[PDB]
Amino acid sequence: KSMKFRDGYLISTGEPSKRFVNTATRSAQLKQGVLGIKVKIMLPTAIDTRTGLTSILPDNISVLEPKT
Amino acid sequence: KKKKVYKKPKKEKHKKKKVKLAVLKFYKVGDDGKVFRLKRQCDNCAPGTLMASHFDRDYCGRCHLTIMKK
RNA sequence: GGGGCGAGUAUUCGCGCAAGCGAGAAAGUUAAAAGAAUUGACGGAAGGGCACCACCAGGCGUGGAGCUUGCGGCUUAAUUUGACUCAACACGGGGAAACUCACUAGUUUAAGACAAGAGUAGGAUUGACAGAUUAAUAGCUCUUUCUUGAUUUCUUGGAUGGUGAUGCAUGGCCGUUUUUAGUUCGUGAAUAUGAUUUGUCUGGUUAAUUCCGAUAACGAACGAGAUCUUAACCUGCUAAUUAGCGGCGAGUACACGUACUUGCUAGCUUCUUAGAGGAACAUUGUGUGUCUAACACAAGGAAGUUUAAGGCAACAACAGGUCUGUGAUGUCCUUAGAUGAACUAGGCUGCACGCGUGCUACACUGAUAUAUAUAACGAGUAAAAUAUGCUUGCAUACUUUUCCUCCGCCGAAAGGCGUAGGUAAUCUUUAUCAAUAUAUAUCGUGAUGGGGAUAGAUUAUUGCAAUUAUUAAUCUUGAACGAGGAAUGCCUAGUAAGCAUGAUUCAUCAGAUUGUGCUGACUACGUCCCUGCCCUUUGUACACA
Numbered sequence: 001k002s003m004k005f006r007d008g009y010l011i012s013t014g015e016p017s018k019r020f021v022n023t024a025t026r027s028a029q030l031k032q033g034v035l036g037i038k039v040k041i042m043l044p045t046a047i048d049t050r051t052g053l054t055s056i057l058p059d060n061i062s063v064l065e066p067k068t
Numbered sequence: 069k070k071k072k073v074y075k076k077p078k079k080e081k082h083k084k085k086k087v088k089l090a091v092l093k094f095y096k097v098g099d100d101g102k103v104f105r106l107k108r109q110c111d112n113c114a115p116g117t118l119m120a121s122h123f124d125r126d127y128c129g130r131c132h133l134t135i136m137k138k
Numbered sequence: 139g140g141g142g143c144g145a146g147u148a149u150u151c152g153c154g155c156a157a158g159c160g161a162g163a164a165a166g167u168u169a170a171a172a173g174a175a176u177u178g179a180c181g182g183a184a185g186g187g188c189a190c191c192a193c194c195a196g197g198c199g200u201g202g203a204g205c206u207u208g209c210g211g212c213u214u215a216a217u218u219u220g221a222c223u224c225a226a227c228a229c230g231g232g233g234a235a236a237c238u239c240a241c242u243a244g245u246u247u248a249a250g251a252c253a254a255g256a257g258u259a260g261g262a263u264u265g266a267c268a269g270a271u272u273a274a275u276a277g278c279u280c281u282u283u284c285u286u287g288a289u290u291u292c293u294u295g296g297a298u299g300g301u302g303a304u305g306c307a308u309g310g311c312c313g314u315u316u317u318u319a320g321u322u323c324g325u326g327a328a329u330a331u332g333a334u335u336u337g338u339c340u341g342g343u344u345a346a347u348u349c350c351g352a353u354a355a356c357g358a359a360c361g362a363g364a365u366c367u368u369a370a371c372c373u374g375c376u377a378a379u380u381a382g383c384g385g386c387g388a389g390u391a392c393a394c395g396u397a398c399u400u401g402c403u404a405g406c407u408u409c410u411u412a413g414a415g416g417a418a419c420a421u422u423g424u425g426u427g428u429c430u431a432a433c434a435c436a437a438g439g440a441a442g443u444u445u446a447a448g449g450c451a452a453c454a455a456c457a458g459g460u461c462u463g464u465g466a467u468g469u470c471c472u473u474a475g476a477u478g479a480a481c482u483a484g485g486c487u488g489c490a491c492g493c494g495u496g497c498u499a500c501a502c503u504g505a506u507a508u509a510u511a512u513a514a515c516g517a518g519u520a521a522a523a524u525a526u527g528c529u530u531g532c533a534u535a536c537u538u539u540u541c542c543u544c545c546g547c548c549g550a551a552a553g554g555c556g557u558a559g560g561u562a563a564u565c566u567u568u569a570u571c572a573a574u575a576u577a578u579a580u581c582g583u584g585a586u587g588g589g590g591a592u593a594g595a596u597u598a599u600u601g602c603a604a605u606u607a608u609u610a611a612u613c614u615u616g617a618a619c620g621a622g623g624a625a626u627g628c629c630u631a632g633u634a635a636g637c638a639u640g641a642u643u644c645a646u647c648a649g650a651u652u653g654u655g656c657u658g659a660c661u662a663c664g665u666c667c668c669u670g671c672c673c674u675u676u677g678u679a680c681a682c683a
């Protein structure tokens with residue numbers, strides 16, 4: 001069987017999903033077989049760029065407030 | 069796939085026949101006529117490496133140098 | 139009226155011309171039969187949509203012949219094995235002479251941890267010349283009799299290895315549904331039981347649950363989009379080597395500057411290379427549409443089907459494939475006459491036949507022979523091998539060589555011998571490493587100078603080894619085939635088709651994959667008729683559907 005446990009927000013496709021996500025796989029030998037472990041963490045909007053500089057997200061268009 | 073068919077018994081392994089205190093047959097000493105070598109000594113091996121007295125030749129068991137009797 | 143079959147059956151009585159009607163059991167057997175809703179799946183029910191793995195208008199074919207290659211079947215000592223609609227069948231990177239190797243016939247080996255007992259220095263055990271014996275130069279075994287020194291050997295446990303079984307015990311990875319457009323949550327409402335609904339929709343629009351809008355719903359999240367890589371534009375910016383152009387001299391010939399060779403080295407970036415930027419938004423005009431969301435045509439422009447091609451890929455699944463990729467792994471087998479590891483030979487390729495992917499053709503819009511002109515993506519350097527003292531072996535430089543190979547000589551050719559450069563924008567070698575093309579001549583509708591299967595003979599190279607013929611070279615031989623029946627595949631622009639080439643495998647071998655360039659069409663600008671997938675209503679006694 002498989003069991004999934006989620007929380008929050010996660011991305012799957014595109015180039016951002018390879019920058020902002022951290023992934024690992026491990027296995028544990030129990031008495032009656034092998035179990036696979038798979039962890040995926042999206043970093044808190046923290047990713048330097050290929051032209052290295054702290055980026056944010058390719059999906060946002062905040063509009064600034066006029067000075068008053 | 070099938071179990072073997074054994075019609076011929078096993079090839080036997082090589083045992084080495086044992087002689088008790090064979091060295092006392094290599095040197096013997098009388099009262100007169102002191103110690104006398106009974107086999108003969110090698111040529112390029114450190115002294116005391118004796119060689120076999122075969123039916124028609126002499127054989128060194130350590131370097132395999134063969135000298136033909138005639 | 140009192141769970142379902144047995145059963146409105148048996149027996150008996152009344153009534154009837156008969157058919158039959160009205161009252162009406164028991165033994166035995168059974169865990170459910172039965173009512174109404176909900177979600178899905180299915181329909182030879184009704185509507186609506188999408189798509190050259192669907193069709194329409196067409197191109198080129200395949201299916202028919204010879205042959206190359208994979209799969210069944212037969213055969214064999216063995217012809218090792220997994221996968222069988224799409225989604226098995228030039229797939230397992232699977233082009234096997236040995237090795238690989240898992241199959242057939244033989245023969246060796248210990249590279250059997252550790253613990254306990256035995257055996258033993260008055261010797262546990264190891265190795266071997268000669269003759270026999272073996273395919274064998276495995277002392278494998280035997281005769282014979284020397285060497286060796288506690289490393290080993292025998293017994294009982296206990297480990298170890300295994301291309302041995304189980305993908306229906308698992309991990310990981312991959313394929314498919316599906317490259318479609320889908321999936322979920324908070325609060326509110328339907329509740330006044332519930333499984334569950336709505337939000338997620340009649341309509342218009344888009345490649346798209348993409349948008350506009352209607353509205354018991356108001357808002358959010360993944361997927362789509364955005365993002366990333368390559369291509370197309372820039373005489374504007376930043377640069378000049380292992381890139382070019384230009385500048386200055388000396389020549390060789392011509393015409394009164396042109397072509398080529400050569401020594402040297404003001405400046406510049408068009409050509410070559412590669413970093414940063416910019417550029418398209420449907421801009422402007424005209425039409426259709428609720429004048430919204432959008433669509434079509436024209437002008438400009440390098441570019442107006444999101445400009446072209448790709449990579450990534452939600453929720454949920456399949457008893458899909460793989461334990462023959464793995465010091466990923468559970469269980470079961472086996473472990474000295476081994477199912478461990480090797481060595482010799484053989485098989486995987488055996489041929490009355492059936493099926494899939496392909497290569498070569500059936501000629502004149504051609505075949506043969508000469509000549510002219512012209513690409514893009516690539517790759518490249520512990521062993522054996524060449525030289526003194528010694529009788530096919532030893533000691534010797536790791537001083538040369540092993541990969542791509544220019545050039546010179548020899549040979550019809552394949553190839554051989556001698557010598558450069560290159561660990562590479564520097565050399566091979568690319569202001570060019572191909573073939574379709576183009577020009578001129580011969581042949582002349584004749585299975586023909588089309589086609590090139592099948593056979594004979596000789597010669598080279600790789601390799602320890604070429605027989606069942608590794609590959610290549612020369613002469614000879616010269617089969618079917620005259621456009622392919624029923625069926626069926628791919629495809630909309632620098633695309634189909636035709637034409638060749640670099641890499642992967644690789645000691646030697648491509649009719650195979652995976653990339654690259656060269657020549658370059660016809661037909662549509664649609665539809666729901668066939669096939670497939672999706673949505674709505676509807677029926678259901680289906681839910682392994």
Ligand SMILES: [Mg+2]
Nearest residue numbers: 013014362363
């Ligand atoms: Mg995308």
Ligand SMILES: [Mg+2]
Nearest residue numbers: 139140141142
């Ligand atoms: Mg009853």
Ligand SMILES: [Mg+2]
Nearest residue numbers: 171172173679
């Ligand atoms: Mg029922």
Ligand SMILES: [Mg+2]
Nearest residue numbers: 191192627669
């Ligand atoms: Mg079809």
Ligand SMILES: [Mg+2]
Nearest residue numbers: 193194195196
């Ligand atoms: Mg048609």
Ligand SMILES: [Mg+2]
Nearest residue numbers: 199497498499
């Ligand atoms: Mg053809």
Ligand SMILES: [Mg+2]
Nearest residue numbers: 200201202203
């Ligand atoms: Mg055929």
Ligand SMILES: [Mg+2]
Nearest residue numbers: 208227228495
């Ligand atoms: Mg095949």
Ligand SMILES: [Mg+2]
Nearest residue numbers: 208209210227
């Ligand atoms: Mg086969």
Ligand SMILES: [Mg+2]
Nearest residue numbers: 233234608647
């Ligand atoms: Mg071969």
Ligand SMILES: [Mg+2]
Nearest residue numbers: 300301461464
């Ligand atoms: Mg294994």
Ligand SMILES: [Mg+2]
Nearest residue numbers: 305457458459
């Ligand atoms: Mg499976």
Ligand SMILES: [Mg+2]
Nearest residue numbers: 305310311460
């Ligand atoms: Mg699996």
Ligand SMILES: [Mg+2]
Nearest residue numbers: 335336337338
């Ligand atoms: Mg719903």
Ligand SMILES: [Mg+2]
Nearest residue numbers: 373407408409
């Ligand atoms: Mg330039």
Ligand SMILES: [Mg+2]
Nearest residue numbers: 461462463464
């Ligand atoms: Mg394995």
